[PDB]
Design a protein around this ligand. Structure first.
Ligand SMILES: [K+]
Ligand SMILES: [K+]
Ligand SMILES: [K+]
Ligand SMILES: [K+]
Ligand SMILES: [K+]
Ligand SMILES: [K+]
Ligand SMILES: [K+]
Ligand SMILES: [K+]
Ligand SMILES: [K+]
Ligand SMILES: [K+]
Ligand SMILES: [K+]
Ligand SMILES: [K+]
Ligand SMILES: [K+]
Ligand SMILES: [K+]
Ligand SMILES: [K+]
Ligand SMILES: [K+]
Ligand SMILES: [K+]
Ligand SMILES: [K+]
Ligand SMILES: [K+]
Ligand SMILES: [Mg+2]
Ligand SMILES: [Mg+2]
Ligand SMILES: [Mg+2]
Ligand SMILES: [Mg+2]
Ligand SMILES: [Mg+2]
Ligand SMILES: [Mg+2]
Ligand SMILES: [Mg+2]
Ligand SMILES: [Mg+2]
Ligand SMILES: [Mg+2]
Ligand SMILES: [Mg+2]
Ligand SMILES: [Mg+2]
Ligand SMILES: [Mg+2]
Ligand SMILES: [Mg+2]
Ligand SMILES: [Mg+2]
Ligand SMILES: [Mg+2]
Ligand SMILES: [Mg+2]
Ligand SMILES: [Mg+2]
Ligand SMILES: [Mg+2]
Ligand SMILES: [Mg+2]
Ligand SMILES: [Mg+2]
Ligand SMILES: [Mg+2]
Ligand SMILES: [Mg+2]
Ligand SMILES: [Mg+2]
Ligand SMILES: [Mg+2]
Ligand SMILES: [Mg+2]
Ligand SMILES: [Mg+2]
Ligand SMILES: [Mg+2]
Ligand SMILES: [Mg+2]
Ligand SMILES: [Mg+2]
Ligand SMILES: [Mg+2]
Ligand SMILES: [Mg+2]
Ligand SMILES: [Mg+2]
Ligand SMILES: [Mg+2]
Ligand SMILES: [Mg+2]
Ligand SMILES: [Mg+2]
Ligand SMILES: [Mg+2]
Ligand SMILES: [Mg+2]
Ligand SMILES: [Mg+2]
Ligand SMILES: [Mg+2]
Ligand SMILES: [Mg+2]
Ligand SMILES: [Mg+2]
Ligand SMILES: [Mg+2]
Ligand SMILES: [Mg+2]
Ligand SMILES: [Mg+2]
Ligand SMILES: [Mg+2]
Ligand SMILES: [Mg+2]
Ligand SMILES: [Mg+2]
Ligand SMILES: [Mg+2]
Ligand SMILES: [Mg+2]
Ligand SMILES: [Mg+2]
Ligand SMILES: [Mg+2]
Ligand SMILES: [Mg+2]
Ligand SMILES: [Mg+2]
Lengths: 93, 62, 77, 95, 6, 45, 6
RNA sequence: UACGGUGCUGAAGCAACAAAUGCCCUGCUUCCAGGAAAAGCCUCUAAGCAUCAGGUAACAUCAAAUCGUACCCCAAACCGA
RNA sequence: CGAAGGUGUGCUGUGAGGCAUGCUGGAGGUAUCAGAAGUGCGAAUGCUGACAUAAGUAACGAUAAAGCGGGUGAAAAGCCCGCUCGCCGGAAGACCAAGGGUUCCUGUCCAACGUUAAUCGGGGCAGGGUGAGUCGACCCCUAAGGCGAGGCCGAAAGGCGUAGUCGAUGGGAAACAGGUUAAUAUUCCUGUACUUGGUGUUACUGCGAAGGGGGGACGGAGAAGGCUAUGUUGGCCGGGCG
RNA sequence: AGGACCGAACCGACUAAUGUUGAAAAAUUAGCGGAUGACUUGUGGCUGGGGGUGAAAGGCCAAUCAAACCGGGAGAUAGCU
RNA sequence: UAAGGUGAUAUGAACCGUUAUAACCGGCGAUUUCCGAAUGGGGAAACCCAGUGUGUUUCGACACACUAUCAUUAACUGAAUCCAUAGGUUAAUGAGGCGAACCGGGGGAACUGAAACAUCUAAGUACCCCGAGGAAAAGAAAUCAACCGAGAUUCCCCCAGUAGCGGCGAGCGAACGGGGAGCAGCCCAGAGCCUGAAUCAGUGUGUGUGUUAGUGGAAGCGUCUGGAAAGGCGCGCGAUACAGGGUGACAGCCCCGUACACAAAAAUGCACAUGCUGUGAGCUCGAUGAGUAGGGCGGGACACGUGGUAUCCUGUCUGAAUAUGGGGGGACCAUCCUCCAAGGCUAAAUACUCCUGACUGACCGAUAGUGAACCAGUACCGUGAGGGAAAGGCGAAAAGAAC
């Protein structure tokens, strides 16, 4: 049991890409941007509660932010956590 | 709006918090999907959450 | 440190002076000795690091007076 | 308080439009105002065309138009019914 | 989980 | 030819890092001087 | 933990 | 076939010989210069616990987080402006 | 109705200078008499910036080496594709650690960067990309050594050190083959495994450590046998008849 | 067996040429010495400036060494240019 | 306080608001991750790993709080060792770290000068260290003076580059006394009487008075030149306001101000008035700081370098009298004068400015002025300490050049 207030903060956005699209069509895996301090257990709990789908497993990685220049002034985008959430077979988001 | 929330109880404020957080989650998904046209609603719900949490702390006492 | 527990005598600095008046920095140390003092009140020996001068102070004032002074400074034995 | 406000009929004291009148359309924190019909510039707008549009004028270059006297006036502040009002300096009338 | 403050 | 700078992040941090500086009064004086100068980067950390 | 050095 | 590549279908699939510096080998032999530590681990009991705790085995069930993971790496990405 | 500054011209004083005025400039300037000085530059191998000269000279960074056809393009010796040629092959191949940190992949752009051109790039810009119970870190354990409650010592700062506590370069559980992405894979998928721990149940039960013991736990050299990686040949199977 | 022998890796640096506004602030090329040892190498650790370390050359201690580097005394002093 | 607004580059988007919960400003609150004294343990800062207690659960977990060290006190416990003590645990309270100068203290150079150099100088400076405060320190005569007197300390001007000190070299350099700033005196070393009366502290209520947002705040037109008027010219007007800034060129009257007059729900500085809790005033009787003064030896400090060298401090060894007594008056003695050490507190005049507000300059004006007018302690350089730049200006308005 994680508190719902916590679960309502952990999922930030669906990650849109060719790889994410292929993940959903081939492997029944949604790709999410999640809070940087989100654990696999919290992401699982949140997806099952909020999307109302059975989660099989969560795989996670931290995307390191890119160094970029805006008018010859150097900056760095933020690191963010990606979750590959594999839904149980036949759940279908 | 703090007028209205001040007249609610702790449990009434706690359900309003979860209602706003759920709306905040829904808006965040829409905005991420490129579906939210009304970008201003994100700030509104965020400040509403802050208002409810401020009053919850006032009810429990500083 | 080389500090008399009774008097607070500590190393002081000064000069060696040669016949030609060459000043070289030196120290003057206290004549310190660890000594076990009989305290008849407590029925105990108390070891103090004491200058020879401090031992004459203990002889004159008595160990109980001196130890009472140490307790007021918070200097330990 | 601001002497010149949105919707005021003003008269231009200074510049190419000296003497012309218009309604204050917006009051900027720069200390400038857009007065409708006044201080027209021809912007070369990219796709788009040549567009005549109002450029902001300095607020001290316009005066409140007292329609009674038919001339530029100065504004002062009074309290009436526990509320600050503007009044024309010349005739002492509330705006 | 939330130690940040929730 | 082997040049003088042979980087090791462990040795860097142990030699010059924040905690090495904080460990001694002279290291804390380095940090005081660098704060007073207004350095963006106090240490190699 | 210790006379070996721990 | 969008000339990049996709989808499908699929035979034989053994033997002999040679063979490491790898493995048996933390071995064996031999020598003197005589070749870490500590835990995991196994075992022993102490005080204590004493029809329990705890041990053991079987089965079931759940858990195994977090961070790294791209790319270069005898080099155009590291040390040498 | 044109200040300072800039640039000409004319006049003028013994000189430093002065005056006038054309043009430029577009908002300051300042008589006189006094007052005060960051008050005068050609040198200091002066200092900073700019710009010359040598000079379109030297050089373009291994003498492993190119040739041609086609494509794209404003343009192709250099990019893409193709054929040929050459070079490395205990490496000039492959995988890593350290170190670096997006350089990775895709699209797009060619100013600058690239010792040339560049359509190309480790360059610009944008988007994408790193998936673990088993790999590694973290973690348990210690070495050298570090820190070190008390403590001992030292004008102060501090020094040393006990219990401790850190510290890998060493000791300590477990995953393999195949498939897959433009870009990750012992991490995804398929197939087949394994390890440690928590609960619960069943059966049988002396359990219990900060203590004891065992173990972990160790050198150099040499020799030989048994093997496998691996290779070669045959057989087999498919294709070939130049 | 061996501070044994020949010889790659590996460690070194005797000779020559080149290079000397270098490809390189010490190298390249051809030869050369050691190559089971007083060997060599990775990671980490310790020694600090009149101090260290030195199979000893005043060698080395971050391209700096008969007293490192940085900051300060500091505008040292300069009968000299 | 308000008709606008959602900080900047920086538009746009989607909104919010217009008579009062838009925004903005001020008071008081709330929230306030992680690192950092960093404090639960560890650590390569911004990370890794816990214990304990409560509460909660979907038994997978979740939430919250506490857990550093040292000092002091208290309780409890508890060795050798019988008492006891050391030690142990727990609780409360405090400390810790940072900060530009000024301040007190512990240590303490050398270059340099002396035309070399050692005494001496530089200098008790630089620097290191410890500690404090809004200031610190000092301070209520064992002080001077000179036979007259003064009356704590501190600071300023003189005395005076004097007297002196000095390889009598280089240099160092008083005091007495005078003029000023500012002034303030007290307590313990002890009982008794009388009582809590004096005076400052602490913590409240008022009371004014500052501060932290604000409010009102005078009076100009015509014409000429011009892209534009604030300029010229003409004629007016305000001024307890002609400080200053802005506006299309130079504005008392266009705008913001300025003089002047007002303002606080709330917090808070200060000065008083008045409770409460500590605090004890006053009088008589006393008492009167000992390993100390002084001495020998070694140093140091005094302007004073051991000198004929008083006086102060003390590392070392000694060691009085204690009011019928003792210190000082620049070797020393006598006489006389003067003061009372070995306990302590004490405002003001004085020092300083990291920082806040206002105001000023015969200060700078982009190679100047800060290193930095600008996203600068940055880029960049360096293992690191540390070093350390360059770089301002379109226009009145972007009207920043459609086609
Ligand atoms: K990978
Ligand atoms: K690597
Ligand atoms: K001119
Ligand atoms: K003048
Ligand atoms: K010159
Ligand atoms: K040339
Ligand atoms: K070319
Ligand atoms: K793992
Ligand atoms: K971990
Ligand atoms: K043939
Ligand atoms: K040295
Ligand atoms: K000297
Ligand atoms: K000299
Ligand atoms: K006019
Ligand atoms: K104006
Ligand atoms: K003005
Ligand atoms: K004495
Ligand atoms: K006397
Ligand atoms: K500068
Ligand atoms: Mg998985
Ligand atoms: Mg992972
Ligand atoms: Mg071998
Ligand atoms: Mg990889
Ligand atoms: Mg000059
Ligand atoms: Mg010149
Ligand atoms: Mg000259
Ligand atoms: Mg040149
Ligand atoms: Mg040519
Ligand atoms: Mg030539
Ligand atoms: Mg030639
Ligand atoms: Mg040539
Ligand atoms: Mg080349
Ligand atoms: Mg071209
Ligand atoms: Mg071709
Ligand atoms: Mg070529
Ligand atoms: Mg090709
Ligand atoms: Mg890049
Ligand atoms: Mg690439
Ligand atoms: Mg080019
Ligand atoms: Mg690129
Ligand atoms: Mg230690
Ligand atoms: Mg450990
Ligand atoms: Mg290791
Ligand atoms: Mg790859
Ligand atoms: Mg085989
Ligand atoms: Mg040999
Ligand atoms: Mg050598
Ligand atoms: Mg060679
Ligand atoms: Mg030989
Ligand atoms: Mg050989
Ligand atoms: Mg020699
Ligand atoms: Mg060197
Ligand atoms: Mg020297
Ligand atoms: Mg000096
Ligand atoms: Mg000089
Ligand atoms: Mg800690
Ligand atoms: Mg901690
Ligand atoms: Mg303190
Ligand atoms: Mg000299
Ligand atoms: Mg004081
Ligand atoms: Mg008298
Ligand atoms: Mg006002
Ligand atoms: Mg006014
Ligand atoms: Mg102008
Ligand atoms: Mg006395
Ligand atoms: Mg005396
Ligand atoms: Mg004495
Ligand atoms: Mg004497
Ligand atoms: Mg002396
Ligand atoms: Mg005397
Ligand atoms: Mg400058
Ligand atoms: Mg200029």
């Amino acid at each position: 049991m994680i508190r719902e207030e916590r679960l309502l903060k952990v999922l930030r956005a669906p990650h849109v890409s060719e790889k994410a699209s292929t993940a959903m069509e081939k492997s029944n895996t949604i790709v999410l941007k999640v809070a940087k301090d989100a654990t696999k257990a919290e992401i699982k709990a949140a997806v099952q509660k909020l999307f109302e789908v059975e989660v099989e497993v969560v795989n996670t990685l931290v995307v390191k932010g890119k160094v970029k220049r805006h008018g010859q002034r150097i900056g760095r985008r933020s690191d963010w956590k990606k979750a590959y959430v594999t839904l149980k077979e036949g759940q279908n988001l | 709006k703090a007028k209205e929330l001040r007249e609610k109880s702790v449990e009434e404020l706690n359900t309003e918090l979860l209602n706003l957080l759920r709306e905040q989650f829904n808006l965040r998904m829409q905005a991420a999907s490129g579906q939210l046209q009304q970008s201003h609603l994100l700030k509104q719900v965020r400040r509403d959450v802050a208002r409810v949490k401020t009053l919850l702390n006032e009810k429990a006492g500083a | 440190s080389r500090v008399c527990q009774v008097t607070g005598k500590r190393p002081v600095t000064g000069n060696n002076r040669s016949h030609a008046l060459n000043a070289t920095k030196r120290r003057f140390l206290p004549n310190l000795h660890s000594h076990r003092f009989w305290v008849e009140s407590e029925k105990r020996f108390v070891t103090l690091r004491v200058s020879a001068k401090g031992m004459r102070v203990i002889d004159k004032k008595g160990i109980d007076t001196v130890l009472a002074e140490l307790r007021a400074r918070g200097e330990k034995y | 308080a601001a002497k010149i406000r949105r919707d005021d009929e003003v008269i231009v004291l200074t510049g190419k439009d000296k003497g012309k009148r218009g309604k204050v359309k917006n009051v900027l924190s720069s200390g400038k105002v857009i007065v409708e019909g006044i201080n027209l510039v021809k912007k070369h707008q990219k796709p788009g065309g040549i567009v005549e549009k109002e450029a902001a004028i300095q607020v001290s270059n316009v005066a409140i138009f007292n329609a009674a006297t038919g001339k530029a006036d100065r504004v002062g502040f009074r309290f009436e019914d526990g509320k600050k009002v503007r009044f024309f300096k010349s005739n002492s009338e509330t705006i | 989980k939330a130690x940040r403050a929730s | 030819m082997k040049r003088t700078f042979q980087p090791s992040v462990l040795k860097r941090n142990r030699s010059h890092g924040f905690r090495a500086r904080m460990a001694t009064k002279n290291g804390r004086q380095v940090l005081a001087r660098r704060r007073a100068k207004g350095r963006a980067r106090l240490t190699v950390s």
